[PDB]
């Protein structure tokens, strides 16, 4: 599908160009099937402010700043759900079981969130390391779970998902905290398969992926019917077969 | 489990309650009444829509048909489907067994009578053979199927995942299958547009975000023998 | 055991052997010393609908949808 993004030219001025590009993937297939079933029109484009969303002193950003301030309508892309996001907008029903997980290098060292590694790295003889992506809702989930874990993670931060992947492959990182199915897809296509996942979402968050709509949208009931129609006939399983590769 | 969920709901929001039971062992299906060609419901939906009930606290199978009639909350349980067998191919590995596509009198498989799994298979327009086969052996409750396969009279039973995982933790001869299809969620059966929706859903999400789900796992799910 | 062998078409016996209890009866080859013909759609002489039906059949074969229908309605086990 076509898309546009307001990419700036230089850093002295704020003028830019709406570069038009192509989009494929999973949520593109979801939006195409919604356009087949519900028979509506969509205006798809990319965000230019940054990531999903973060309340910076009662000021949101990104897709939250686009939906809450009503410059857009909804987000077909994936989004984690917590308390204040459900306070500001209305989410739809979930469709996929995507919790959180920890990627490490069959034997299993970490059992889950109740690990003895999650107390002090001085307890174990190698000083290990694990972080998350910046400006993320997983950081907010940890800060609502354990502020001391945020204090240890402050010296353990990193930049990029592929950067953390290269750091795990070479040895510049020990463990990493992310979501489950995206790491499963990245490990199902990786050559060598040295990085091994932990569990299947047992001592983890075990949340879902929904579609955030505005408070009082008439499309919400139709989307809630259409998602249960798309899951309840194996077509969601067909899309999972198309966009996931379960090896071993 | 759901009684402790209701205890958590009554601890969060101050409201009293009245726990009673449904008169049968069925979820509720959309059946012709025997006069004037009219659709009616029964079971928990028939007791809810008649005004005698207020809130169905049960592992409700979320589908598209019941979403058209009532409003749904956020799911508290997230699981799939599996096959109960007893322990040559002793496993079946899901629906893709060609012997289950064209069954016979040997592979005895069925489900609970008037269940939502039968409605989900009725939407599947390419598995009418299983719909015609399982209608001769539908039982009243799932415990009847557990007792029948305990006497080695059944051979397969489509059911939710963690219930049979807990029963496999109780009895080692109960064996589940390997595949995980129909990855869905179970929530609380609700009424229409009502002020008992938003605050209750926020309380459920508050139970999701903390370790109270892990506490409920420590009560029954994580506890093994 | 009231008959030794039986001469019939190929794919119908392949479908019957693909759903048979135990797969006792065994086919012979894949049409090597046989006719190995095909099935078409019979139309009357002078019908203008032939070209559109031929284009629709070439559309149905040339995208794997015919292969999907053959996967749905045939099962080549044993």
CB < 8 Å to B208, chain A:
205, 207
Contact A228 B63 (CB under 8 A): yes
β-strand partners of B197: none
Contact criterion met (CB < 8 Å) for B64 and A96: no
Please count the residues of chain A.
248
The token pair at B101 is: 């596509």
Contact C75 B126 (CB under 8 A): no
Chain A contact set for B64 (CB, 8 A): 225, 228-229, 232
Q: In this complex, do C21 and B126 lie within 8 Å of one another by their Cβ atoms?
A: no
Of A149, A189, A188, A187, nearest in space to A168 by CA: A187
Tell whether B51 lies on the interface with C, counting CB pairs under 8 A: no
Query: C47 CB contacts (<8 Å, ≥6 apart)?
Result: none
Give the Cα separation of B11 and B26 in Å (integer): 30
Tell me the C-alpha distance between B157 and B177, whole Å.
10
Among B residues 151-180, those touching chain C with beta carbons less than 8 Å apart:
none
On whether the CB atoms of residues A204 and A113 are closer than 8 A, the answer is yes
Closest CA to B94 of B104, B105, B80: B80
Measured between beta carbons, which residues in chain B are less than 8 angstroms from residue A222?
A: none
Q: What angle, 0 to 180 degrees and rounded to 10, lies between the N-to-C axes of helices C50-61 and C65-73?
A: 70
Residues of A with CB under 8 A from a CB of B: 81-83, 86, 93-94, 96-97, 113, 141, 144, 202-203, 205-208, 224-225, 228-229, 231-234, 237
DSSP B217: I
Structure token pair of residue A193: 């398969």
Residues C19, B104: C-beta atoms closer than 8 Å: no
The whole-angstrom separation of Cα A21 and Cα A2 is 6
Measured in degrees and rounded to the nearest 5, phi and psi for residue C31 equal 90, 35
Task: Show the beta-strand stretches assigned E in chain A.
Answer: 2-8, 16-22, 90-91, 100-103, 130-131, 175-179, 212-213
Partner residues linked to B77 by β-bridges: B186
Q: Tell which phi-psi region holds residue B149, choosing left (phi > 0), alpha (psi between -120 and 50) or beta.
A: alpha
Residues of chain A with Cβ-Cβ distance to B162 below 8 Å are none
CB contact under 8 A, C18 and B98: yes
Tally Cβ neighbours within 10 Å of residue A161.
Answer: 14
Residue A78 marked ligand-binding: yes
With touching defined as 3 or more inter-chain CB pairs under 8 Å, the answer for chains A and C is no
Name the residue in chain C with its Cα closest to that of B107: C21
- Judge: A203–B68 Cβ closer than 8 Å, yes or no: no
């Amino acid at each position: 599908v076509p898309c546009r993004k307001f990419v700036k030219i230089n850093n002295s001025t704020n003028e830019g160009m709406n570069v038009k590009k192509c989009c494929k993937g999973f949520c593109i297939d979801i939006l195409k099937k919604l356009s087949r079933t519900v028979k509506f029109t969509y205006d798809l484009y990319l965000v230019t402010n940054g990531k999903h969303g973060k309340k910076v002193n009662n000021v949101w950003n990104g897709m939250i700043g686009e939906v809450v301030y009503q410059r857009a309508v909804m987000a077909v892309g994936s989004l984690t759900i917590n308390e204040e996001r459900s306070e500001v907008v209305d989410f739809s029903v979930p469709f996929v079981e995507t919790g959180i997980s920890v990627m490490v290098s069959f034997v299993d060292q970490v059992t889950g969130l109740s690990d003895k590694k999650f107390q002090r790295p001085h307890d174990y003889s190698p000083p290990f390391r694990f972080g998350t992506v910046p400006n993320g809702s997983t950081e907010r989930n940890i800060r609502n779970n354990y502020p001391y874990m945020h204090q240890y993670m402050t010296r353990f931060n990193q930049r990029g998902v592929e950067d953390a992947l290269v750091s795990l492959k070479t040895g510049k990182l020990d463990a990493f905290i992310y979501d489950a199915a995206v790491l499963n897809y990245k490990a199902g296509r990786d050559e060598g398969c040295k990085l091994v996942t932990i569990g299947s979402g047992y001592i983890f968050a075990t949340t879902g992926y929904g579609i955030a709509l505005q408070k009082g949208s008439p499309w919400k009931r139709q989307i809630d019917l259409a998602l249960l129609q798309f899951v309840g006939d194996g077509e969601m399983e067909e899309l999972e077969t198309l966009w996931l590769t379960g090896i071993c | 489990f759901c009684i402790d969920l209701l205890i958590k709901l009554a601890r969060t929001m101050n409201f009293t309650y009245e726990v009673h039971l449904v008169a049968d062992g069925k979820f509720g299906t959309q059946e012709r009444v025997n006069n004037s060609n009219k659709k009616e419901w029964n079971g928990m939906m028939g007791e809810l829509l008649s005004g005698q009930a207020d809130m169905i606290v049960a592992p409700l199978t979320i589908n598209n048909e019941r979403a058209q009639y009532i409003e749904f909350s956020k799911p508290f349980k997230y699981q799939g489907l599996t096959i109960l067998v007893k322990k040559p191919e002793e496993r079946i590995t899901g629906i893709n067994d060609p012997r289950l596509r064209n069954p016979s009198d040997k592979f005895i498989y069925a489900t609970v009578k008037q269940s939502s799994v039968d409605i989900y298979f009725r939407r599947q327009v390419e598995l009418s053979t299983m719909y015609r086969h399982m209608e001769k052996h539908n039982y009243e409750s799932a415990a009847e199927a557990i007792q029948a396969v305990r006497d080695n009279k059944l051979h397969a039973f489509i059911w939710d995942s963690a219930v049979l995982e807990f029963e496999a933790s109780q009895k080692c001869d109960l064996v589940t299958t390997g595949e995980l299809f129909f990855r869905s969620g179970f929530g609380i059966g609700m009424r229409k547009d009502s002020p008992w929706k938003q605050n209750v859903s926020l309380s459920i999400l508050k139970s999701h975000e903390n370790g109270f789900m892990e506490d409920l796992d420590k009560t029954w799910v994580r506890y093994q023998e």
